[PDB]
Coordinates of C-alpha atoms and ligand atoms in Angstrom, one line a residue:
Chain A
X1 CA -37.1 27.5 4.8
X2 CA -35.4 25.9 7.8
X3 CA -32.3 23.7 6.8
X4 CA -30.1 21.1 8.9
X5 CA -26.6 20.5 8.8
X6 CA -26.1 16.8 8.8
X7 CA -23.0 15.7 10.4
X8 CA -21.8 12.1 9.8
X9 CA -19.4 9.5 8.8
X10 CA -17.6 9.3 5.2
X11 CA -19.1 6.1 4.5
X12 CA -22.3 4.5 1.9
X13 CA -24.5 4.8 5.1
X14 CA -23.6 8.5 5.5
X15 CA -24.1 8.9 1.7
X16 CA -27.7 7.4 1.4
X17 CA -28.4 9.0 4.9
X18 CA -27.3 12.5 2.9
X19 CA -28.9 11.9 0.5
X20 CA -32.7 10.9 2.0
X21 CA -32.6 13.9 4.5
X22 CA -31.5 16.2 1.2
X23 CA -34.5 14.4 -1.1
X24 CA -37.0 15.9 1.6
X25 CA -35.4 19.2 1.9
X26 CA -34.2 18.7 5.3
X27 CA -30.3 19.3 5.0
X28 CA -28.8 22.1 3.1
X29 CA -25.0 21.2 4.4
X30 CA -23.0 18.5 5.3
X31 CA -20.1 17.7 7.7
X32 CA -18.1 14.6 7.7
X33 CA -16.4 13.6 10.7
X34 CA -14.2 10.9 12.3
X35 CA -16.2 9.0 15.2
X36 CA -13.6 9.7 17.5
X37 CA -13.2 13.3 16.9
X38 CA -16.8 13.3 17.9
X39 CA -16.0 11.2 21.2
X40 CA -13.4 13.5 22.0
X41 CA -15.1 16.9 21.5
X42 CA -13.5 18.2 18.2
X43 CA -16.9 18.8 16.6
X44 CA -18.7 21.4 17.9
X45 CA -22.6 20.7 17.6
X46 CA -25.7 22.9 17.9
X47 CA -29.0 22.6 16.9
X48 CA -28.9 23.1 14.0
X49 CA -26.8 20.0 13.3
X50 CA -28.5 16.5 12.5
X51 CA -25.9 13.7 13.7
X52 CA -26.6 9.7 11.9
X53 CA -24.5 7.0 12.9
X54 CA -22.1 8.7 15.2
X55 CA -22.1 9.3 19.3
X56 CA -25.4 10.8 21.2
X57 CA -25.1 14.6 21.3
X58 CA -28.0 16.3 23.6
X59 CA -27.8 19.7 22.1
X60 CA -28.0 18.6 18.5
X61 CA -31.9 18.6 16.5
X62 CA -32.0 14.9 15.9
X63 CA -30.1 12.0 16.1
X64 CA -30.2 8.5 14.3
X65 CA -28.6 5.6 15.4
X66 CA -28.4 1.5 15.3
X67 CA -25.5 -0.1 17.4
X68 CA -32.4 10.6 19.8
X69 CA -34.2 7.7 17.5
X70 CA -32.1 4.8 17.8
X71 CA -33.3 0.8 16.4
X72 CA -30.0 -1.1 17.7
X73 CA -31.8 -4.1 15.2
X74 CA -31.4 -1.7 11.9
X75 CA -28.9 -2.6 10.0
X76 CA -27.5 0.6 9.4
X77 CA -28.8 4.6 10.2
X78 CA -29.8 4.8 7.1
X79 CA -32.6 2.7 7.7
X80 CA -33.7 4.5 10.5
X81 CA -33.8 7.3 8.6
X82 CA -35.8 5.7 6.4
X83 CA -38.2 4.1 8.4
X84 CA -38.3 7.7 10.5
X85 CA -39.6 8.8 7.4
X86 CA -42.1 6.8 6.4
X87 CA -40.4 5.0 3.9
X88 CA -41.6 4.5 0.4
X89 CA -44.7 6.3 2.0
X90 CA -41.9 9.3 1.6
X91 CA -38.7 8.3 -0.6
X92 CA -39.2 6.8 -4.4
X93 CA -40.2 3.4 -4.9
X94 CA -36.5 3.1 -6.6
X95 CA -34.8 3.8 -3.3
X96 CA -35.5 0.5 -2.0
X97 CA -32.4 -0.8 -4.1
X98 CA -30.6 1.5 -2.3
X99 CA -32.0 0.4 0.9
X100 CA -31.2 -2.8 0.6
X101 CA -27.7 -2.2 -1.0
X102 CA -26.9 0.3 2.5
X103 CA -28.1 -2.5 4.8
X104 CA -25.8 -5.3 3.5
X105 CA -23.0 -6.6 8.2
X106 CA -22.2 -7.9 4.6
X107 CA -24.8 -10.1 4.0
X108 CA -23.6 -10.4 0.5
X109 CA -23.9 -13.4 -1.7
X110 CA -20.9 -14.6 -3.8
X111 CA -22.6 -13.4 -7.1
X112 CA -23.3 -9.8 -5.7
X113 CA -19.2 -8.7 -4.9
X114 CA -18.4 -10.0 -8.1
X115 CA -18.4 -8.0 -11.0
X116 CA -20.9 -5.9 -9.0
X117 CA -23.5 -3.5 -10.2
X118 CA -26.1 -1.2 -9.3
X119 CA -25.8 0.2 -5.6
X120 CA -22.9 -2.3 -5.0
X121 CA -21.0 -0.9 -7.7
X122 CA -21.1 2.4 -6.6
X123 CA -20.5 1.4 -2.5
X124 CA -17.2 -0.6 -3.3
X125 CA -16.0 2.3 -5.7
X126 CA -16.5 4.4 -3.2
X127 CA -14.7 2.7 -0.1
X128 CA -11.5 3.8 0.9
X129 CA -10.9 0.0 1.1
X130 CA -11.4 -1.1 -2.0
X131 CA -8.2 1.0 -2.6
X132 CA -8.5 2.8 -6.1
X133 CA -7.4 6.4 -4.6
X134 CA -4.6 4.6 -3.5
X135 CA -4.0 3.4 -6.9
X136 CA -4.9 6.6 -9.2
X137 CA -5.1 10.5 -8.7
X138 CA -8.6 10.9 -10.6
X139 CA -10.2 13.9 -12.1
X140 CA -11.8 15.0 -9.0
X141 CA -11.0 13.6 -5.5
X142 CA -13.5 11.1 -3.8
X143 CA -14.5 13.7 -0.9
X144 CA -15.7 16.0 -3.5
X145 CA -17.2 13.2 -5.2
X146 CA -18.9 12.3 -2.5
X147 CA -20.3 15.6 -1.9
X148 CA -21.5 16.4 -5.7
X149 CA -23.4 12.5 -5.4
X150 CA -25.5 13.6 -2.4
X151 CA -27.7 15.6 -4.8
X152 CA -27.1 14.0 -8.4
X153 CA -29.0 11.2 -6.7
X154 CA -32.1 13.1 -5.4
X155 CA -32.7 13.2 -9.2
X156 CA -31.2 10.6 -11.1
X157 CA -31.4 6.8 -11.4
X158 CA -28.6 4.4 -10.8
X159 CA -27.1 3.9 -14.2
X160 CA -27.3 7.1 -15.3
X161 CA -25.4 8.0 -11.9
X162 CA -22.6 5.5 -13.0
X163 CA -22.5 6.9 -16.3
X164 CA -21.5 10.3 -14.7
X165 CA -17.9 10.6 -16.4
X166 CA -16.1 11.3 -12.6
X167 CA -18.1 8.3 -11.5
X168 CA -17.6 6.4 -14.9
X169 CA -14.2 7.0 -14.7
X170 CA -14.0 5.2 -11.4
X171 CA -16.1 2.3 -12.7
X172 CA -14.0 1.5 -15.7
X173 CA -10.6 1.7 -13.3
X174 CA -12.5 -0.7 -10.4
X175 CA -13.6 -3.6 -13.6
X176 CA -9.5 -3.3 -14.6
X177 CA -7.9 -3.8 -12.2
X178 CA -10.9 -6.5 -10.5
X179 CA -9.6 -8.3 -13.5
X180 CA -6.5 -8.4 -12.8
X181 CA -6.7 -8.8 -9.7
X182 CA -8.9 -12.3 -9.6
X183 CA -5.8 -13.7 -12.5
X184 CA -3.5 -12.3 -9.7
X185 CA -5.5 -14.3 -7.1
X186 CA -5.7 -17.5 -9.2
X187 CA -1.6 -17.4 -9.3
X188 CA -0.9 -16.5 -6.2
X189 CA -3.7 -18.1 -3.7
X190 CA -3.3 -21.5 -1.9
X191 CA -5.8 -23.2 -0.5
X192 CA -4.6 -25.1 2.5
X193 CA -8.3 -27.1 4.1
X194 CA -10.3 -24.3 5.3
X195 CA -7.6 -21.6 4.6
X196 CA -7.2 -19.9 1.4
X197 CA -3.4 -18.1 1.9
X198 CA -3.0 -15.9 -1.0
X199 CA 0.6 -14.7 -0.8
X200 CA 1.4 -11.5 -2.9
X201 CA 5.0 -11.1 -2.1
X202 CA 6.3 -12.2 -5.7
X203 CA 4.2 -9.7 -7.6
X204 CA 4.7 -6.5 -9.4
X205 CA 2.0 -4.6 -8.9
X206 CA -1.1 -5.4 -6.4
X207 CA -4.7 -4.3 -7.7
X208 CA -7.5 -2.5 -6.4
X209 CA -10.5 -4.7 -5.4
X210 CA -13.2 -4.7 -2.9
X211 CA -12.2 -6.8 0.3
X212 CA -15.0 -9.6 -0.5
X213 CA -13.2 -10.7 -3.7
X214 CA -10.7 -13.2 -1.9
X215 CA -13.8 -14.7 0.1
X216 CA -16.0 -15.1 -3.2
X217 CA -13.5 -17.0 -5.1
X218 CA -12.9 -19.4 -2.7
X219 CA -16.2 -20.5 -1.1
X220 CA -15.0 -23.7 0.5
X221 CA -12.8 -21.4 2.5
X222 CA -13.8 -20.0 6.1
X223 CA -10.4 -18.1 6.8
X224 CA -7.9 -15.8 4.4
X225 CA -4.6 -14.8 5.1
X226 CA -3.0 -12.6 2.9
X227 CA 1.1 -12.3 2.7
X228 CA 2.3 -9.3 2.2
X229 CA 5.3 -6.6 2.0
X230 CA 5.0 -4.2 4.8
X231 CA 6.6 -0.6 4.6
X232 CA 9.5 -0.2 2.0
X233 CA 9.3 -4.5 2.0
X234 CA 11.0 -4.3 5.0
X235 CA 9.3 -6.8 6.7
X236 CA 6.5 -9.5 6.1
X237 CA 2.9 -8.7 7.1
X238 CA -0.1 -11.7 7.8
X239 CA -3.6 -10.3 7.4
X240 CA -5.8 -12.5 8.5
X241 CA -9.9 -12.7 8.0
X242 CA -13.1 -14.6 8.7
X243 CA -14.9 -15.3 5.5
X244 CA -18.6 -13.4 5.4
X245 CA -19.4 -16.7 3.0
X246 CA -18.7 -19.4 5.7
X247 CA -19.0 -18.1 9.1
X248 CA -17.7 -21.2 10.5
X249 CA -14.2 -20.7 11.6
X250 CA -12.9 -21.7 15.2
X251 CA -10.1 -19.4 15.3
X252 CA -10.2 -16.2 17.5
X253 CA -7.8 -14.7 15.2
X254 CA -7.0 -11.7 17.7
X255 CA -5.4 -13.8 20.1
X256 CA -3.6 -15.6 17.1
X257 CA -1.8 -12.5 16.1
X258 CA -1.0 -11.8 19.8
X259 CA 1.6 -14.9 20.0
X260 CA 3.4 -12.7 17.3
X261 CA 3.0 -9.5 18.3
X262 CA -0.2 -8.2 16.5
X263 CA -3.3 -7.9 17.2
X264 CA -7.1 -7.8 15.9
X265 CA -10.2 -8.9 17.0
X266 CA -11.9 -12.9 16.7
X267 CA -12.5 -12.0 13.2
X268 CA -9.5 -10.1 11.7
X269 CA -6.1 -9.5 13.1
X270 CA -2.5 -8.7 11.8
X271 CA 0.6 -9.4 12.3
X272 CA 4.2 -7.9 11.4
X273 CA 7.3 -10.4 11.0
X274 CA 11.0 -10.2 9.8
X275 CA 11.5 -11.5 6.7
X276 CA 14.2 -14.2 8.4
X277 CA 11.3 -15.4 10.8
X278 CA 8.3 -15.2 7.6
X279 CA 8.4 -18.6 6.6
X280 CA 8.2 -20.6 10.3
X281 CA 5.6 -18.3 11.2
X282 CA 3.4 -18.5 7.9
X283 CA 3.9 -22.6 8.4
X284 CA 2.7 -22.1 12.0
X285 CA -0.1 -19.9 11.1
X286 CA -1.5 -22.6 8.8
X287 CA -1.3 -25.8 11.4
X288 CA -2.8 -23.7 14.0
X289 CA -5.3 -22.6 11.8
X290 CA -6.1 -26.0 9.8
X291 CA -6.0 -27.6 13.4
X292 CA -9.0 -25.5 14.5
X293 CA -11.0 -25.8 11.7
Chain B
X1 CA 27.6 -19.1 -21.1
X2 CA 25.8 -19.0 -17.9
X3 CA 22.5 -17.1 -16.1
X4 CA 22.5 -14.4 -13.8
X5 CA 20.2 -14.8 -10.4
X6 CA 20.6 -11.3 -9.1
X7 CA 17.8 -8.4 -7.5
X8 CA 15.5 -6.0 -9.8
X9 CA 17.4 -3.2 -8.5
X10 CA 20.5 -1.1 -10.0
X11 CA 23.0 -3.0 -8.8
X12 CA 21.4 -5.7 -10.8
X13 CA 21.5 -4.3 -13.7
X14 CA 25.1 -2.8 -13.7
X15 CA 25.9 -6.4 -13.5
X16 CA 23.9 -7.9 -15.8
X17 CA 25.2 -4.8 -18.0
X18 CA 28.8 -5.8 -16.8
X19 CA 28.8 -9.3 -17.8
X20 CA 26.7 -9.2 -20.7
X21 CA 29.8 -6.9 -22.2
X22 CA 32.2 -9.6 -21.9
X23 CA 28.8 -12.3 -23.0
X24 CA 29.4 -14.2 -19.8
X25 CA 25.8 -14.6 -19.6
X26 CA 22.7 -15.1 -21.9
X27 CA 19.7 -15.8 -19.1
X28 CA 18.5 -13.6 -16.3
X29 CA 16.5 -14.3 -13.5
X30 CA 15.5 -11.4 -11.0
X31 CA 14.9 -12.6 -7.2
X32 CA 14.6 -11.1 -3.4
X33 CA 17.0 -12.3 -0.9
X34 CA 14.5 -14.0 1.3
X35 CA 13.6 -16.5 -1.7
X36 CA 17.1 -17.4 -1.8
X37 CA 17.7 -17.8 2.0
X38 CA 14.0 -19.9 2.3
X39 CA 15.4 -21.7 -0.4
X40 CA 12.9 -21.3 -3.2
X41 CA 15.2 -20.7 -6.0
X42 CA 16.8 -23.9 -7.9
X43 CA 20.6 -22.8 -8.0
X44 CA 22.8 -24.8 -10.5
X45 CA 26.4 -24.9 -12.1
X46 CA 24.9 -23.0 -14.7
X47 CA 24.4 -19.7 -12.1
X48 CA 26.2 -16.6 -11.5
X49 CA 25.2 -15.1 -8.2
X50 CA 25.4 -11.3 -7.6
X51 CA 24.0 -9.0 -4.7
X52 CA 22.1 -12.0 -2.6
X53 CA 23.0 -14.8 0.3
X54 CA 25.5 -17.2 -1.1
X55 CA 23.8 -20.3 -2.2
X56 CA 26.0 -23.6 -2.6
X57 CA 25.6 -24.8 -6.6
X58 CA 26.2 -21.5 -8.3
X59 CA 29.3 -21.2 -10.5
X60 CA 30.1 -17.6 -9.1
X61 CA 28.9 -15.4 -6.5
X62 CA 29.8 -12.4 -6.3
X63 CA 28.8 -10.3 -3.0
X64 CA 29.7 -7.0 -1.0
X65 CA 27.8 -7.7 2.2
X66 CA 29.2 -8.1 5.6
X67 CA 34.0 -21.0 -0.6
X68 CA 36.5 -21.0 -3.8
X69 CA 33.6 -19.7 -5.7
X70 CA 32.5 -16.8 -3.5
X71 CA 33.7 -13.9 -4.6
X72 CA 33.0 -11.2 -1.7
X73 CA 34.9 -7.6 -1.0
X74 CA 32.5 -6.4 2.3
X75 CA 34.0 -3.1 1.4
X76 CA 32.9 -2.6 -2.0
X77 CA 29.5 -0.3 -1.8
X78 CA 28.0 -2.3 -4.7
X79 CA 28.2 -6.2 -6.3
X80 CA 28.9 -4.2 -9.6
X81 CA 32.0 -3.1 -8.1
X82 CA 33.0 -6.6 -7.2
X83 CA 32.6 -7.6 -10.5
X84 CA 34.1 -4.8 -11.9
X85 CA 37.1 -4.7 -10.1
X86 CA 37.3 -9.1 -10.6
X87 CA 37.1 -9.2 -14.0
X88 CA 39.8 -6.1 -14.5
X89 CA 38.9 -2.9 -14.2
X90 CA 39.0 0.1 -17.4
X91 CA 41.2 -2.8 -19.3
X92 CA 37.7 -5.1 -19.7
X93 CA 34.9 -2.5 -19.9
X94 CA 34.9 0.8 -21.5
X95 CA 36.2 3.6 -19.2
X96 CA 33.3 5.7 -20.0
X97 CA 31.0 3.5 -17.8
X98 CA 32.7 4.7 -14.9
X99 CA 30.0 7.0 -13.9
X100 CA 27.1 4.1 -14.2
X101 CA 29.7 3.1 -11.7
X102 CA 29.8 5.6 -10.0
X103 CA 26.2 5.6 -9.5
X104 CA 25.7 2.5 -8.5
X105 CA 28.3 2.7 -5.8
X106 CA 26.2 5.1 -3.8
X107 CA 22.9 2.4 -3.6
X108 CA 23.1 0.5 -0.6
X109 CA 25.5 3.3 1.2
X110 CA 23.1 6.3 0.1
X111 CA 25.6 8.4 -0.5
X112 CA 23.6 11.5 -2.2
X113 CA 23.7 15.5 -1.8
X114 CA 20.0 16.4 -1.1
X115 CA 20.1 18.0 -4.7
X116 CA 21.0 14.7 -6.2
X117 CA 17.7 13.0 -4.6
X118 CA 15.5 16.0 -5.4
X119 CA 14.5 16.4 -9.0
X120 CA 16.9 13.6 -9.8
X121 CA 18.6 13.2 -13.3
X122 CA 20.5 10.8 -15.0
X123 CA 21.7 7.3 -13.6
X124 CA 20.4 8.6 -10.2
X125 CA 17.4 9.2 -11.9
X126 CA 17.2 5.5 -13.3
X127 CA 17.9 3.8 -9.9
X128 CA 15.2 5.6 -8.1
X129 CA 12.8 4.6 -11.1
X130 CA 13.7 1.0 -10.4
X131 CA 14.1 1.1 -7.0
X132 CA 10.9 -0.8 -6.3
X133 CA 10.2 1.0 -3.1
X134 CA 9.8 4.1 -5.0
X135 CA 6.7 2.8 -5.6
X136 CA 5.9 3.4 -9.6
X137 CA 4.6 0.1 -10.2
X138 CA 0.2 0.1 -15.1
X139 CA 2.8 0.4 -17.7
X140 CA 2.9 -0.8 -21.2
X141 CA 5.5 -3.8 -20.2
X142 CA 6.3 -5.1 -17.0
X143 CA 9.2 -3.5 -14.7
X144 CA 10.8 -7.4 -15.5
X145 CA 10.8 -6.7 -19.2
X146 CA 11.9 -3.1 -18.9
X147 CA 14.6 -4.3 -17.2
X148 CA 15.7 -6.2 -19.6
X149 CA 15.4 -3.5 -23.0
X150 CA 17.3 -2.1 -20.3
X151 CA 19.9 -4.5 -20.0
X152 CA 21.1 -4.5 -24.0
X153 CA 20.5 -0.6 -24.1
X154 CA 22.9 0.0 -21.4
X155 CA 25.7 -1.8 -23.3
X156 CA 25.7 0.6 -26.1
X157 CA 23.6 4.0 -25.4
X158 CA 24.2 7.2 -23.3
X159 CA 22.3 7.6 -19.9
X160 CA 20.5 10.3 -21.8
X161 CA 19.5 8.5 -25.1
X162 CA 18.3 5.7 -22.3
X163 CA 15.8 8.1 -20.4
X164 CA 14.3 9.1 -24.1
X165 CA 13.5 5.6 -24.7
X166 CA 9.6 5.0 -24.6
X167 CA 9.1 2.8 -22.1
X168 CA 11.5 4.6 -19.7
X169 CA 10.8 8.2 -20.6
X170 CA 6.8 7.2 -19.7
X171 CA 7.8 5.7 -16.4
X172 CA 9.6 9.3 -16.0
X173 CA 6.9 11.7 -16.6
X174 CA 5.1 9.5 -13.8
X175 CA 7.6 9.9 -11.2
X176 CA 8.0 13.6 -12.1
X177 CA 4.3 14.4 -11.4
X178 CA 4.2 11.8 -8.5
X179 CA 7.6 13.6 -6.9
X180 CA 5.7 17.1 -7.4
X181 CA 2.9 16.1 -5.4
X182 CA 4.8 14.0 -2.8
X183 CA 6.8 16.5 -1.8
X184 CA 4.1 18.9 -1.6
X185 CA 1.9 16.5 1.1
X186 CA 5.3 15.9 2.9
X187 CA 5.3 19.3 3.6
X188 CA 1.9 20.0 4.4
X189 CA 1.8 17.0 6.6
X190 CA 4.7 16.8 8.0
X191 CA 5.6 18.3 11.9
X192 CA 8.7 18.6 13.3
X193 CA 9.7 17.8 17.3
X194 CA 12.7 18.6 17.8
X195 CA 15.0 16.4 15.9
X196 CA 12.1 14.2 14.4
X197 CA 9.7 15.0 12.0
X198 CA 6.4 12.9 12.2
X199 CA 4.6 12.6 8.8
X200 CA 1.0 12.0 9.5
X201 CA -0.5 10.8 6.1
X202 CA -3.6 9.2 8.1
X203 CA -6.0 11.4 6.0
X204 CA -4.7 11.6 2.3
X205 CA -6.7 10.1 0.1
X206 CA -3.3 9.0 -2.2
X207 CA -0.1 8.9 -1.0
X208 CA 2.5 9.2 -4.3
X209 CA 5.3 7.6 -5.4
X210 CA 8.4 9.4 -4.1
X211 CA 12.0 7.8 -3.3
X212 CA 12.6 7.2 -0.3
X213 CA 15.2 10.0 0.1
X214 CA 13.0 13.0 0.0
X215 CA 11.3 13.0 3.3
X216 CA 15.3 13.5 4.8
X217 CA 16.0 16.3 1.9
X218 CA 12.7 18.4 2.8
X219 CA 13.8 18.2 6.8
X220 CA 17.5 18.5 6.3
X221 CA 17.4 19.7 10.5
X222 CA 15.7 16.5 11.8
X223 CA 17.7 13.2 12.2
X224 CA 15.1 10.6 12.1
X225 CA 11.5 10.3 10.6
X226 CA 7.9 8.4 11.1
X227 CA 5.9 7.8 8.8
X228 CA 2.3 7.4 10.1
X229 CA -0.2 5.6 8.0
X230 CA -3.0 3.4 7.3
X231 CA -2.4 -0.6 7.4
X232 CA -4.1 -2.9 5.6
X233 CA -7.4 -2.3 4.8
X234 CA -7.2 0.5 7.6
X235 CA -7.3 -2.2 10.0
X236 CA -4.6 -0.4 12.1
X237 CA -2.0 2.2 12.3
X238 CA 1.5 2.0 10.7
X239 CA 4.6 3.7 12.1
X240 CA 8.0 3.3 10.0
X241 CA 10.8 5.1 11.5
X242 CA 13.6 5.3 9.8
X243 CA 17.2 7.7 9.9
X244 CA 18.3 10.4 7.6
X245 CA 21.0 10.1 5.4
X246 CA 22.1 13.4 5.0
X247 CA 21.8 13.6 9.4
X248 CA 23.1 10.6 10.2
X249 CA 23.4 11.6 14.1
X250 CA 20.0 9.9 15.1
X251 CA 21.1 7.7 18.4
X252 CA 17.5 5.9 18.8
X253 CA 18.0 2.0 18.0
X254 CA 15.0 2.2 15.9
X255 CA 14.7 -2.3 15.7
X256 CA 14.6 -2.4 19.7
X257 CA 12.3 0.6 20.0
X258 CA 9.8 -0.9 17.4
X259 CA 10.1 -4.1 19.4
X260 CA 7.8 -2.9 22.2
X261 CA 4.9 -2.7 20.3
X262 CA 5.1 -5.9 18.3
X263 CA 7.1 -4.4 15.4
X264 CA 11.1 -4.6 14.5
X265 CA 14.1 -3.9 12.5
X266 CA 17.3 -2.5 13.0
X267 CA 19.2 0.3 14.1
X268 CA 18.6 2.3 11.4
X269 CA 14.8 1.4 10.4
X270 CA 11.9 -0.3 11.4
X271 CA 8.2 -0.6 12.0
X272 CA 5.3 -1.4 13.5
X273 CA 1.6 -1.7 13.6
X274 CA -0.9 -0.3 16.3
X275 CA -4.6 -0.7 17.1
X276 CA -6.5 2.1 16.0
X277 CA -7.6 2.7 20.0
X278 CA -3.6 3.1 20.7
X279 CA -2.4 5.0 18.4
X280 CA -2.4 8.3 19.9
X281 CA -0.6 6.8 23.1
X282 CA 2.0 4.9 20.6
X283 CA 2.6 7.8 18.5
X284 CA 3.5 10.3 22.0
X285 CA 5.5 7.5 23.2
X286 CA 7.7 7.4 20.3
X287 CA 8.1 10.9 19.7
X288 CA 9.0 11.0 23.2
X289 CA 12.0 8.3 23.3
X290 CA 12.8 9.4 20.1
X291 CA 13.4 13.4 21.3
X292 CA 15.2 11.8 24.5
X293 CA 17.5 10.1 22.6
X294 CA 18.5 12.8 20.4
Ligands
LIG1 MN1 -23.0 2.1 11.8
LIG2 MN1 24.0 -4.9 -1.9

């Protein structure tokens, strides 16, 4: 009769690790919570509380991590949870789709981020990222979605989950405006070398679509940098990426975007320039980048 | 006859409206200032010029911004008054279009009541629908094409028969219902220090189309606003400060104060864009200066 609370991130790992630990009638309520908020001590957390893929709490019944049962060579809690469990020894033979779809440091192919399907579908739909509750007001909002797919999946496949008209309704928005956006992409994007600059600042309207898209459609590429408007279009904003598809770029692209003022990490960084200054810098981006390779 | 080069914006169109009436022009080409000053926009004899940098080729250019060709008053509040005023005033164009006119005067000044950018009507109601950092644009045909059923209807029907055309009465239901529940998160989110209110939109799930204006009518006692929000991809944090225009009293030089942190402007507005890890230290830093400043 016993039930958990399981606190976690809004994410797909949170999702599948929801909806595992609610398939063996371990969870009967759910919390989700920024990591931070947990660093900081804004979540209070007994015993009662089942924590995956946030910070160690000692007071709390158990928790599952990957970066107390913690496997730092999972790719994601959900796994552990899953492997905790015995696996298909516990959870349908099904779930392994799932499973694998949770597991994917994005190791994606081209194929799977395009036009996507299944688990994939339903994990870019889902992402804040991917941007289409920045780009509609649906029915229902995605938290609650969230919450009602922890339990519609206990006990239903994966196409008749995206066939669920709040889900549905996401699906047919996402394959709109992917559409639109890969036609938007085919007018706007440049390839300089190993740089694919994809400059948006002429169009109308951007589109929703998951943040593999760009990479996808331009294999040859290692590096993206997308132009575009910043607040109000008062200024000029360089996003800069690492392609998941070729891993081979030289550029620590955190300390790129520090010569302008921005920041990021070796993989992604920003910047923010004044529209006067856009065009020197977006030429300087490009040597410095084509000169590293 | 000759082409327009001018911006997607109000001021645009009372021009295009302008010298349409006296069929000056028959082609119209919308464009942002920073094309023309990178130079990315072929300018010929052939072009009028209104409301952007002066380019050297263009038959006229007519401009209200701080040679023979150039026509500039850096006192007029709109290009549309420029080429109002050059071309002759009520003698040339009807003296009923003096409240377009009038409208499109208070653009780049912001001249509004609060009740004027609240639940807006009329041709205040049209700018903000144009006004691309209103934020509307799925429609039926493209804000370019609208703009120009726009164009023609303007020479000949009332600002009210306009707004009941289809393709502008369906952009107005949107902004209605967007407006409604703007206002209603800038509320809910929104905390005021002192003379500032910080909007904290971090954890909406939409934020909805709204001009620009409102945030200033909903805190009529603050002089000076941030907007803190998600950047790309939520990558980082954005901060956009910016004055009020119905409290125009703010004394933080917004530009150099976003300058610290990698961002910019000027006086009156700016930005920038803060690791996720900063944020909190960024966001009391600015309120701080901003509450010292008054
Ligand atoms: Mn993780
Ligand atoms: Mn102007």
């Amino acid at each position: 009769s016993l039930k958990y609370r399981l606190v976690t991130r809004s994410d797909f790992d949170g999702l599948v690790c929801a909806v595992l630990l609610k398939s063996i009638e371990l969870i009967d309520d759910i919390q989700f919570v920024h990591p931070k908020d947990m660093q900081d001590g804004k979540v209070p957390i007994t015993e009662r509380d089942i924590i995956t893929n946030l910070p160690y709490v000692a007071n709390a019944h158990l928790v599952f991590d990957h970066h107390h049962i913690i496997n730092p060579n999972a790719p994601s809690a959900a796994r552990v949870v899953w492997e905790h469990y015995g696996g298909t020894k516990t959870f349908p033979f099904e779930w392994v789709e799932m499973m694998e779809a949770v597991d994917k440091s994005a190791q994606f192919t081209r194929d799977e981020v395009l036009d996507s399907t299944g688990w994939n579908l339903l994990n870019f739909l889902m992402d804040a990222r991917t941007g289409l509750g920045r780009f509609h007001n649906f029915r229902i909002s995605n938290y609650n979605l969230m919450m009602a797919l922890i339990d519609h999946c206990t006990h239903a496949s994966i196409d008749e989950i995206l066939q669920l008209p709040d889900v549905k309704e996401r699906v047919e928005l996402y394959r709109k405006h992917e559409t639109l956006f890969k036609e938007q992409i085919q007018r706007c994007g440049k390839v300089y070398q190993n740089l694919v600059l994809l400059d948006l600042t002429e169009e109308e309207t951007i589109y929703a679509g998951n943040r593999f898209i760009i990479y996808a459609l331009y294999p040859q590429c290692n590096i993206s940098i997308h132009k575009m408007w910043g607040f109000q279009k008062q200024n000029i904003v360089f996003a800069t990426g690492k392609s998941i598809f070729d891993r081979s770029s030289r550029t620590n692209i955190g300390e790129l975007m520090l010569k302008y003022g921005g920041g990021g990490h070796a993989a992604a960084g920003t910047c923010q320039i004044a529209i006067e200054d856009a065009d020197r810098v977006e030429k300087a981006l490009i040597t410095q980048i084509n000169a590293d390779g």
